[PDB]
């Protein structure tokens with residue numbers, strides 16, 4: 001690679017490692033914020049729009065219930081998520097602003113991106129044109145080059161985790177499955193339609209799973225549906241492992257060729273995982289129009305700007321029951337979460 005890229009990534013890794021080795025902790029508290037709206041809710045956590053009472057800034061606060069994290073065997077994953085997020089810095093990664101814990105919950109306070117999930121926009125328009133899909137894909141390629149150079153695997157690429165910001169660029173959110181891995185790792189995680197075959201088959205897998213997931217994402221952006229779609233997970237998994245994918249006739253030949261190379265079942269043949277690494281992707285004809293530096297510098301005009309009224313607008317998110325943020329009188333699971 002150009003010495004320019006090598007030197008950039010060396011500095012990126014140095015800066016990451018300093019924060020990785022000495023993580024920030026306990027940088028705000030709950031009563032510094034007002035709750036505005038619940039933006040998402042799951043089996044062990046929620047995301048809420050909050051406002052800082054002194055500065056007036058809006059943030060997305062992820063709240064994890066310690067007891068449920070333990071019950072669902074997510075302890076290490078939650079520690080990974082926060083330790084990684086506090087240490088990374090890249091234009092297409094959502095910024096962690098504060099973190100803290102209390103007797104009941106873990107809190108990560110992040111930039112709020114009012115444009116909403118790529119998923120919503122994709123489903124509302126049907127499919128993205130190839131230029132539009134390529135603009136987003138280029139951001140993911142650069143983000144994975146950054147993450148992988150820090151020995152990080154992301155492991156949850158899907159349209160719901162990609163927020164569209166005020167300039168129309170992507171912000172990757174949700175580092176719940178991200179992990180620092182030199183070599184292989186084994187945990188079954190991700191989302192069914194996006195899992196690489198080696199995850200399904202319970203192998204020791206590596207960063208090549210992220211490049212597989214990029215193939216799934218690009219297909220879904222350009223087609224409007226994912227390549228291995230089926231009604232139940234087991235049927236999805238059978239399709240993933242089969243080595244068979246069908247492409248819409250509207251796909252360009254270049255798109256089909258790139259996707260066949262990202263969706264290689266044999267991980268030793270998969271683009272992003274060959275001897276030339278990410279450059280096989282960056283140099284592919286489908287990316288011939290992409291100015292990688294201009295994308296990194298946010299100098300390209302985006303395909304669209306989401307419609308929203310301001311930094312507190314929640315219109316691009318959907319409606320959930322509002323539930324308490326209860327804090328027990330007694331500390332729960334203190335030992336498990338000491339490092340948070």
Ligand SMILES: COC(=O)[C@@H]([NH3+])Cc1ccccc1
Pocket residue numbers: 268269270274
């Ligand atoms: C496309 O490149 C690849 O798949 C590389 N693993 C090179 C290779 C090809 C065939 C057999 C062995 C090795």
